[PDB]
Amino acid sequence: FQGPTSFHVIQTSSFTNSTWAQTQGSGWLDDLQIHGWDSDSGTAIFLKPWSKGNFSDKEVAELEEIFRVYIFGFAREVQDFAGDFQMKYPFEIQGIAGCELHSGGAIVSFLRGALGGLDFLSVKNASCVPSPEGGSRAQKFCALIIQYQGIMETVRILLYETCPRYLLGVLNAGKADLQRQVKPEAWLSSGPSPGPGRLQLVCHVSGFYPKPVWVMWMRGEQEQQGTQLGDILPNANWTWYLRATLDVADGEAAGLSCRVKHSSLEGQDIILYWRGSGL
Amino acid sequence: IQRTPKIQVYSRHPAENGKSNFLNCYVSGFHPSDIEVDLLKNGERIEKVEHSDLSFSKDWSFYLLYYTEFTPTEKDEYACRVNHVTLSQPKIVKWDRDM
Ligand SMILES: *[C@@H]1O[C@H](CO[C@@H]2O[C@@H](C)[C@@H](O)[C@@H](O)[C@@H]2O)[C@@H](O[C@@H]2O[C@H](CO)[C@@H](O[C@@H]3O[C@H](CO[C@H]4O[C@H](CO)[C@@H](O)[C@H](O)[C@@H]4O)[C@@H](O)[C@H](O[C@H]4O[C@H](CO)[C@@H](O)[C@H](O)[C@@H]4O)[C@@H]3O)[C@H](O)[C@H]2NC(C)=O)[C@H](O[C@@H]2O[C@@H](C)[C@@H](O)[C@@H](O)[C@@H]2O)[C@H]1NC(C)=O
Ligand SMILES: CCCCCCCC/C=C\CCCCCCCC(=O)O[C@@H](COC(=O)CCCCCCCCCCCCCCC)COP(=O)(O)OC[C@@H](N)C=O
Ligand SMILES: *[C@@H]1O[C@H](CO)[C@@H](O[C@@H]2O[C@H](CO)[C@@H](O)[C@H](O)[C@H]2NC(C)=O)[C@H](O[C@@H]2O[C@@H](C)[C@@H](O)[C@@H](O)[C@@H]2O)[C@H]1NC(C)=O
Ligand SMILES: *[C@@H]1O[C@H](CO)[C@@H](O)[C@H](O)[C@H]1NC(C)=O
Ligand SMILES: [Cl-]
Ligand SMILES: [Cl-]
Ligand SMILES: [Cl-]
Ligand SMILES: [Cl-]
Ligand SMILES: [Cl-]
Ligand SMILES: [Cl-]
Ligand SMILES: [Cl-]
Ligand code: NA
Ligand code: NA
Ligand code: NA
């Protein structure tokens, strides 16, 4: 099927000093935000009418309270253990947890944590695995967290039992938005000169959904291997933008075209033709 | 180690003077998360700007999208202004139709 295949929650907990800490959070289907989190109130924000998936109001409220207690509790516990862990303020902790649907139908769950923008820990087989970058500190954290069977069990249930049924429920509930097809528009421009006697030609592709797209500089039916793809950039309203560039000598730009293939075009590729001397 | 933001400014549609469009500013690769982003019209802050909630990539670097609806003209100048702990003063990246 097309569109996102995973769901994840992210946490960014910023510890300014011994008395001040704040956490930002959100829920996502791949790169598409479906939940917000109010840092102040500790309540979820449902961004889409189908953001609760097939979960009842009861179960959604239960999970919000799990996250509310966890988020408040996490800052409380990090502040209390900051001395023992030789933490210098300010520091920032990040976490990502969720699950994903694979080809063949298996659903795989993950949980990763970071400290100072570096990998700190991960969860494999419902256990705390310290990352090498986390050093002795991540080894001490995994020793501490496994002492508390309450946290371990709650994490296991959320990762391996709650997330998979939530994912299937929300992919279904959101299909009118997630599996829609939006056509790209494309245009050509001239980039900065990459070197002596050379031009840079740019093929812009914008407004497409879903994310998979194919863009190549061509000479007839021949793909130009020099084609450089920029990073896929977001647009507002769940669409994407991409630039495909080509470095050529001035006298060799004639005969070039840019070809765009996307699921929404139903086989009718977009073809733009470069024409010389400002035509 | 703190990472300074990368700033990319681009329009949703090819610019055509007098035609409705969207100006995007994608701020990425920064750490820590605290950041200030503004979109400017002739150096003046645009009040009706929308933005994504904080997210991060696989290397844990943060990213945000700030966008506003705009109509390009021959003379109106647009830019994205960002402040972060890694910078002494706000960094300004001007929107360029030809770049
Ligand atoms: C939200 O949706 C989830 C997914 O639902 C399915 O997909 C969506 C998109 C729609 O198309 C739905 O109509 C469709 O149901 C729901 O979770 C799914 O629930 C079903 C039960 O309805 C459940 O099926 C059962 O599976 C077990 C076996 O499960 C084990 O083994 C499989 C591999 O084989 C493995 O993948 C699992 O993880 C487990 O290890 C099976 O024993 C059951 O059989 C019994 O019931 C059937 C009739 O249903 C009967 O014919 C049999 O004879 C026998 O009595 C049954 O087939 C799915 O496994 C489950 N999917 C996941 C990923 O968990 C979800 O339902 C709720 O959670 C379920 C876990 C279960 O408690 C339900 O009763 C709950 O309502 C739904 N709602 C919520 C709130 O999550
Ligand atoms: C429908 C929309 C939503 C979609 C569904 C979302 C599916 C989510 C998918 C993945 C999430 C994984 C969750 C990881 C967060 C930890 C949760 C927790 O332990 O929380 C508890 C923990 O809270 C604390 O005690 C604070 C301690 C936190 C510090 C621990 C930090 C460690 C966290 C990382 C775990 C790594 C270790 C992995 C080993 C298995 C608090 O919960 P509680 O039940 O105790 O609260 C009770 C509440 N019901 C009413 O009172
Ligand atoms: C992955 O997690 C499994 C569940 O916790 C592990 O099995 C468990 O092994 C424990 C031994 O320390 C034991 O207490 C558990 O009761 C048992 N769980 C089950 C499924 O009954 C699993 O590896 C096991 O342990 C190793 C040492 C061998 O005895 C294997 O045969 C077991 O499967 C974990 N696998 C890892 C860590 O790679
Ligand atoms: C702690 O951090 C907060 C948040 O930035 C700050 O306003 C406050 O002044 C700090 N407290 C002290 C006493 O340094
Ligand atoms: Cl605090
Ligand atoms: Cl330590
Ligand atoms: Cl798994
Ligand atoms: Cl940090
Ligand atoms: Cl064109
Ligand atoms: Cl428009
Ligand atoms: Cl706007
Ligand atoms: Na517009
Ligand atoms: Na203008
Ligand atoms: Na351009």
Residue numbers in the entry:
A (entry chain A): 4 to 282
B (entry chain B): 3 to 101
What does the primary publication say about this deposited structure?
The human CD1 family of antigen-presenting molecules (CD1a, CD1b, CD1c, and CD1d) is structurally related to MHC class I (MHC-I) molecules with the key exception that CD1 proteins bind lipidic antigens. The unusually spacious cleft allows CD1b to capture either two small lipids or particularly large lipid antigens. Recently cloned TCRs, termed PG10 and PG90, mediate autoreactivity to target cells that express CD1b, and the response was augmented by adding micromolar quantities of PG.
PG, PA, and PS are relatively conserved in the size of their head groups, so steric clashes with the TCR are not envisioned. Although the serine moiety in PS is similar in size to glycerol, the NH3 group might provide electrostatic repulsion within the PG90 TCR pocket.
